[PDB]
C-alpha cells in the first residue's frame, strides 16, 4: 500500500504503563531498518488462550502473536509456515537458535515458531527472601528438596509467624526430573531418573507421592497458604510477605542476579531439579505469524530485528535509556601477548585487515580507547580528498622535474645540505626549461576544477 | 575446477618465519567459511613497485595484491572493478568502511581497492625511548615541533653521546599540516594552515624552510645520522641505539600503546601535526584484485572474511594462540538500572526477544556469566524432545480423563488434601470407564515409535 506497513502483534499479560513511549522508541529503529512499524496489543494473563483461540477463528486480522496451544494449532494450519522465511528474512535470527529450539518446534517437517532464545534448558529452584534470611539468621545450606525445606519453614513459622513460609498458588505441583512431553492437564510423564523409554503416571512414582505427602504436611502446619487451591493473588518479589517460593531459572538469568534485580534485594536460590532441554523449555515463548497475515515477509523482518538488534531489544526490555537504565561499560575482547610474539612471528595490522576487529592488548587503557573514539569522531576531511591529477598534457615536464628533484631532494630533505644554498640551486634547475611552471599551473587549474565540482 | 580454489595474494615486505603455521591456521577458517584457500607470497620492501609493475605486465597470474601506484594503475585498467562485488561478496566489509575510504579510493566513478580499515586519519609524532628518558631524567613537556626538540637532543648528546639523538633515514622530510594529494616525488602541496584552494611549493612555505634550517643545524651538531642521505639501516624499536624518532600514529594505535607493545618498553609520543583524512591516509594500504584473475568472486569473499572474522584476522596479526598470545577477557556490554525501572515500565525478557543480546546488569558477576556458559555447554536433550502425541484415536477418552482430572488435581497437587485418600479416589474415577488405559497405551505405543524413529 501507500504507507509503510503496520504489523500487529498480540502479546500475553498486561501492558506496560509506558507502552506508547516504548513503541515510539522501538519504531524509530524498526522504521529506519525495515521500513515498517510494530503495534503491540496486550490481551491479559487470565483468558489468553480463550481470547486467542475463539476471537481469532471468527473475528480479527493479525500478523504476529505469542502462541497458545502451539503444537495443536500448528497441525490445524493456524500458523504460517516459517521454513522458507527463515532462509532469507529470518536468516540471522535462525543462526542464533540452539538446535534444540528447532527440534522442539518442528511439526510434520515444518517450523511454525520464532522461539525466544533464552532458557533452552532450565531447572526448578527454591528462591529465598534474603532480607528475612539475614534478619533471622536462618541457614539454608541443607536445602535440596521439598523434604529438606521443612526445617527452614519450621524456623520462619516460629520466628516470623505472619510471613507466608512457602508462597505457592493454585497452579502448583511438585517438580521433579520429569518430562511432560504433552501439555494437556494429564498425569503422564517420562521419569528422567527411571526408564526413559516408558510413559508413567506421576501419581504412581514413589518420590512424587512422597512430595505430595510432604506438601500436605506443610498444609496442616500452615507453611503454605490456607486457600492455595483457590487463590489468584500473586506474591510480590519486592515485599516481605513471603520467605520461600519456587522459580524456574536457566542460563539466561545468570544465577540469582535477575531475581535480585527484579526484587531489588538479595534473592538466594537452591535448585530442586537438574537442567534439560525438552518440549516445555523449547516451546515456552513462541511467536507465530498468522496464516492469514497480509504481511508475512515484513512480520519476519520485524521478528528478525527484535532478536538481533541490541538497541531495539534493550530499549523494550530495560525500558527508556536515561530513565530506566544507563550504560556503564562497552564490550571489550582483550588479550596479552606472550614470549612467542616478535616482529618475525606474525603479520602487521596496518596492511592485513580491519584493525577494529583486532583484540585489545592488555597494555591499552580505557582512556586511550575513549581518546581514539573522540579523535575518529572529530577528524575532518581534506578539501583535496579524492583529487586526481591528470598528467596527460604534462608527461615530459613531470619527468624532467622528477629527474631534477631526485638529484637534490635527499640532500635537502634530510638537512644534510644547508637549504640557504641548496633551495636556490634546485629552483633554478626546475625553472630553467619552464617545466616547473607548466606542471604547477596545470595542477592548480585541475584543483580549481575539482573544488568547483566540474 | 575439481578442487577448492587457491587464491594467490602478493604482499609487501618480508615473510614471517612461521608463515606456513600462520597460513595453516588461517586456512582452517577460510576453507570452512568460503570453500577456498589463501596463499600469501611476500615480495620484499626494496623493489616492490618494480616487482609488481613489470613482472606482472609480462609474466605471472595472480588474484590479490597489496597495491603499488594505485591511482595511476587504476586508470590503466590494471585492477578489477570492485563496485559490484562490494554489493554482494564484500557487503559486510563495505559497511565497516569510513566513507572517506570510499571517496579517497574512487577513480572515475568506480572503486578498485579494498582498503584496510585503520588510520583513516593520522598525525606525525615524535616517539621517545622511555628507557633513556627515565635513566637520564630528560623532560619532554615543552616539545611540540622540530625547533622545540633541540633542547632535548642537546641533553641526550651531552649525557649519552653514543646514542643517535634523532634517528631518521634517507626518506625523511619534515612533516607539517600539508596535503600531498599526488604521490609523485614533486614539491607541490596544499597548505592546510594557509589558503586551502592553492597549490604551493613546500620549499617556498616559510615554516617548512625553517624546518630545513633546523634539520641542517641538527646535522652540523651530530643530532641526526652523518650518513642520513645514503643509509638503509633501520633502528630497532626494542634497542637503546636511538633517543627519538618520527612515527605515524592514528586512532587504531590507541595512543602510545602499540609502539610500547612492539618495542616491549615505554615509548612516549608527542604530536607534530594535526590529524586529517586525506588521499595519503585513505590509500596507504589497498588490496586490489587482478583484472586478469580467474577467481574474482572468491578473492572478494576471502577479503571480506579477512576484514570481518576476528578469529581469522587475530590469528594472522597476533600470531598463534597460546604461543604468541592468550585471551584475558571477552567483550561485555553493561548497564545499571535506575529508579525508573519497575515491573510496569518495561517488557519481559523471556517473551520479547533473544536474551543473549540483552545488556548485562551491574549486579551480575563474572562467575555467574561463566557458570551460564558451562551449563549451556553441559545441558543434554530429553529423549522426548520433539515428541508429538496424536490424539485422533482417543479424543473422547482424553476429554473424559481431563474432565475427571480437573475435579481432583488442584486439591491433590497443592497438598490441600491428603494424597493417601485422594489418589486412590482419583485413580478409580480415571479407570472406571477404561479411558485411562486406552490413552496410556496409545501414548506409550507412539512414544516407542518415536524412539525407534518411525
Ligand atoms: Zn523429587
Ligand atoms: Zn569490558
Ligand atoms: Zn652547514
Ligand atoms: Zn611545521
Ligand atoms: Zn569486558
Ligand atoms: Zn491432613
Amino acid at each position: 500500500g501507500p504507507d509503510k506497513p503496520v504489523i500487529k502483534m498480540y502479546q500475553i499479560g498486561d501492558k506496560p504503563d509506558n507502552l506508547d513511549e516504548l513503541l515510539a522508541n522501538a519504531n524509530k529503529i524498526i522504521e529506519e531498518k525495515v521500513g515498517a512499524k510494530l503495534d503491540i496489543q496486550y490481551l491479559g494473563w487470565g483468558d489468553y488462550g480463550k481470547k486467542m483461540s475463539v476471537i481469532t477463528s471468527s473475528g480479527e486480522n493479525y500478523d504476529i502473536a505469542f502462541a497458545d496451544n502451539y503444537i495443536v494449532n500448528a497441525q490445524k494450519g493456524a500458523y504460517a509456515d516459517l521454513t522458507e522465511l527463515y532462509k532469507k528474512e529470518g536468516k540471522d535470527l535462525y543462526k542464533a537458535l540452539d538446535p534444540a529450539y528447532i527440534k522442539g518446534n518442528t511439526v510434520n517437517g515444518k517450523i511454525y515458531a520464532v522461539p525466544v532464545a533464552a532458557n533452552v534448558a532450565s531447572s526448578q529452584n527454591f528462591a529465598f527472601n534474603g532480607t528475612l534470611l539475614a534478619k533471622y539468621g536462618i541457614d539454608i545450606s541443607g536445602v535440596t528438596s521439598y523434604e529438606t525445606l521443612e526445617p527452614v519453614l519450621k524456623q520462619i513459622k516460629e520466628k516470623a509467624p505472619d510471613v507466608v513460609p512457602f508462597a505457592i498458588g493454585k497452579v502448583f505441583i511438585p517438580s521433579d526430573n520429569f518430562d511432560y512431553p504433552v501439555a494437556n492437564g494429564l498425569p503422564f510423564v517420562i521419569d528422567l531418573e527411571g526408564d526413559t523409554t516408558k510413559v508413567v503416571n506421576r501419581y504412581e512414582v514413589p518420590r512424587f507421592k512422597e512430595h505430595l505427602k510432604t506438601l500436605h504436611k506443610f498444609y496442616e502446619a500452615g507453611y503454605i497458604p490456607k486457600d492455595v487451591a483457590t487463590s489468584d493473588t500473586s506474591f510480590d518479589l519486592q515485599q516481605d510477605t513471603w520467605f520461600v517460593r519456587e522459580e524456574t531459572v536457566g542460563p539466561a538469568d545468570y544465577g540469582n542476579s535477575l531475581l535480585s534485580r527484579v526484587a531489588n534485594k538479595d534473592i538466594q536460590i537452591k535448585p530442586i531439579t537438574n537442567f534439560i532441554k525438552k518440549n516445555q523449555t523449547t516451546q515456552v515463548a513462541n511467536f507465530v505469524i498468522s496464516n492469514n497475515s497480509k504481511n508475512k515477509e515484513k512480520s519476519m523482518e520485524i521478528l528478525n530485528l527484535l532478536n538481533t538488534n541490541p538497541e531495539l531489544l534493550n530499549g523494550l526490555v530495560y525500558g527508556p535509556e536515561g530513565k530506566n537504565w544507563e550504560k556503564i561499560e562497552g564490550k571489550e575482547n582483550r588479550v596479552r601477548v606472550l614470549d612467542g610474539y616478535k616482529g618475525n612471528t606474525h603479520m602487521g595490522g596496518w596492511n592485513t585487515g580491519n584493525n577494529w576487529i583486532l583484540y585489545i592488548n592488555e597494555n591499552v587503557t580505557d582512556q586511550q580507547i575513549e581518546n581514539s573514539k573522540k579523535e575518529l569522531a572529530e577528524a575532518k576531511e581534506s578539501p583535496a580528498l579524492g583529487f586526481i591529477f591528470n598528467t596527460d598534457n604534462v608527461k615530459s615536464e613531470i619527468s624532467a622535474i622528477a629527474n631534477t628533484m631526485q638529484q637534490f631532494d635527499t640532500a635537502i630533505n634530510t638537512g644534510t645540505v644547508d637549504p640557504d644554498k641548496a633551495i636556490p640551486e634546485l629552483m633554478e634547475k626546475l625553472k630553467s626549461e619552464g617545466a616547473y611552471e607548466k606542471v604547477l599551473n596545470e595542477m592548480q587549474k585541475q584543483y580549481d576544477e575539482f573544488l568547483k565540482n566540474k
Side-chain angles (χ1 to χ4, degrees), chain A residues 329-332:
Chain A
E329 145 191 327
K331 73 191 180 294
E332 231 161 73

Side-chain angles (χ1 to χ4, degrees), chain A residues 388-403:
Chain A
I388 298 167
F389 181 41
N390 180 344
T391 58
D392 287 339
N393 289 18
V394 289
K395 249 86 202 286
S396 54
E397 289 81 353
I398 287 180
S399 281
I401 290 162
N403 180 259

Side-chain angles (χ1 to χ4, degrees), chain A residues 186-220:
Chain A
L186 267 48
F188 301 124
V189 299
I190 312 307
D191 185 353
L192 299 169
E193 300 184 23
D195 181 347
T196 63
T197 73
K198 299 296 170 184
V199 178
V200 302
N201 173 359
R202 61 189 182 207
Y203 300 112
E204 297 171 11
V205 175
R207 72 189 187 279
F208 187 78
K209 289 174 46 177
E210 184 61 27
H211 298 329
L212 292 174
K213 176 185 302 310
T214 300
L215 255 196
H216 186 61
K217 285 185 62 176
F218 289 3
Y219 189 75
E220 293 185 354

Side-chain angles (χ1 to χ4, degrees), chain A residues 51 65 81 87 104 111 149 206 237 277 382 395 420 430 432:
Chain A
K51 294 151 177 273
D81 180 22
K87 296 172 174 181
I111 182 162
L149 190 67
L237 278 160
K277 304 182 206 176
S382 176
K395 249 86 202 286
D420 288 344
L430 289 180
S432 68

Side-chain angles (χ1 to χ4, degrees), chain A residues 76-360:
Chain A
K76 296 178 171 175
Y79 310 139
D81 180 22
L82 307 185
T83 310
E84 313 309 313
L85 285 165
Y86 266 131
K87 296 172 174 181
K88 182 180 172 201
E89 288 85 355
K91 195 174 212 74
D92 302 323
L93 135 58
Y94 192 88
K95 265 149 53 169
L97 295 181
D98 187 300
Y101 283 118
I102 305 313
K103 292 192 64 159
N105 288 296
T106 293
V107 177
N108 296 134
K110 294 182 163 41
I111 182 162
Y112 298 93
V114 175
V116 174
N119 294 329
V120 67
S122 66
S123 64
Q124 295 304 113
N125 289 257
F126 296 130
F128 296 87
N129 179 346
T131 309
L132 303 179
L133 291 177
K135 182 168 182 187
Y136 298 111
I138 293 166
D139 193 341
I140 57 168
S141 298
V143 178
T144 64
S145 64
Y146 296 108
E147 292 65 40
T148 55
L149 190 67
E150 180 174 6
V152 160
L153 305 183
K154 185 160 64 61
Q155 286 167 69
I156 200 73
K157 189 62 155 182
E158 189 180 54
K159 293 184 160 185
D162 305 308
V163 174
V164 174
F166 185 26
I168 57 164
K170 72 184 297 202
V171 304
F172 182 87
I173 185 177
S175 297
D176 220 294
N177 295 307
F178 288 168
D179 189 347
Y180 288 87
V182 192
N184 57 0
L186 267 48
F188 301 124
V189 299
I190 312 307
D191 185 353
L192 299 169
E193 300 184 23
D195 181 347
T196 63
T197 73
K198 299 296 170 184
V199 178
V200 302
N201 173 359
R202 61 189 182 207
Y203 300 112
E204 297 171 11
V205 175
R207 72 189 187 279
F208 187 78
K209 289 174 46 177
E210 184 61 27
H211 298 329
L212 292 174
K213 176 185 302 310
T214 300
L215 255 196
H216 186 61
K217 285 185 62 176
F218 289 3
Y219 189 75
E220 293 185 354
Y223 300 155
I224 62 176
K226 297 148 56 166
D227 67 346
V228 62
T230 62
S231 151
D232 57 352
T233 56
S234 72
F235 291 86
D236 187 338
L237 278 160
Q238 295 180 310
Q239 292 171 9
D240 290 324
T241 54
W242 61 275
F243 180 62
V244 64
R245 67 163 66 208
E246 177 162 341
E247 294 288 332
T248 304
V249 185
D253 297 291
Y254 298 119
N256 69 323
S257 60
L258 186 56
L259 283 159
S260 300
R261 181 177 111 198
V262 170
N264 199 37
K265 64 161 70 178
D266 175 37
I267 301 298
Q268 289 298 304
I269 64 173
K270 293 270 162 194
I272 308 168
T273 66
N274 298 320
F275 49 95
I276 201 169
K277 304 182 206 176
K278 55 184 176 175
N279 288 347
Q280 301 158 266
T281 63
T282 56
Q283 301 166 8
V284 69
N286 280 351
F287 288 100
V288 295
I289 291 176
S290 179
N291 197 44
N292 301 140
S293 173
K294 276 74 161 60
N295 269 121
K296 292 178 194 188
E297 291 76 12
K298 288 316 253 202
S299 293
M300 182 59 99
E301 294 192 335
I302 289 172
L303 287 165
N304 186 79
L305 198 68
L306 280 164
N307 286 278
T308 60
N309 185 292
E311 194 185 348
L312 175 54
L313 184 59
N314 285 279
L316 293 165
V317 172
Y318 279 104
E321 189 172 7
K323 302 192 208 179
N324 277 32
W325 62 277
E326 61 188 6
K327 297 182 183 165
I328 64 174
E329 145 191 327
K331 73 191 180 294
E332 231 161 73
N333 298 306
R334 295 246 184 187
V335 302
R336 59 185 175 191
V337 291
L338 298 174
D339 294 329
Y341 184 86
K342 289 286 128 38
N344 59 346
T345 61
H346 64 89
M347 306 186 169
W350 76 276
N351 65 342
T352 304
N354 178 2
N355 287 200
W356 310 113
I357 70 177
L358 294 170
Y359 305 141
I360 307 300

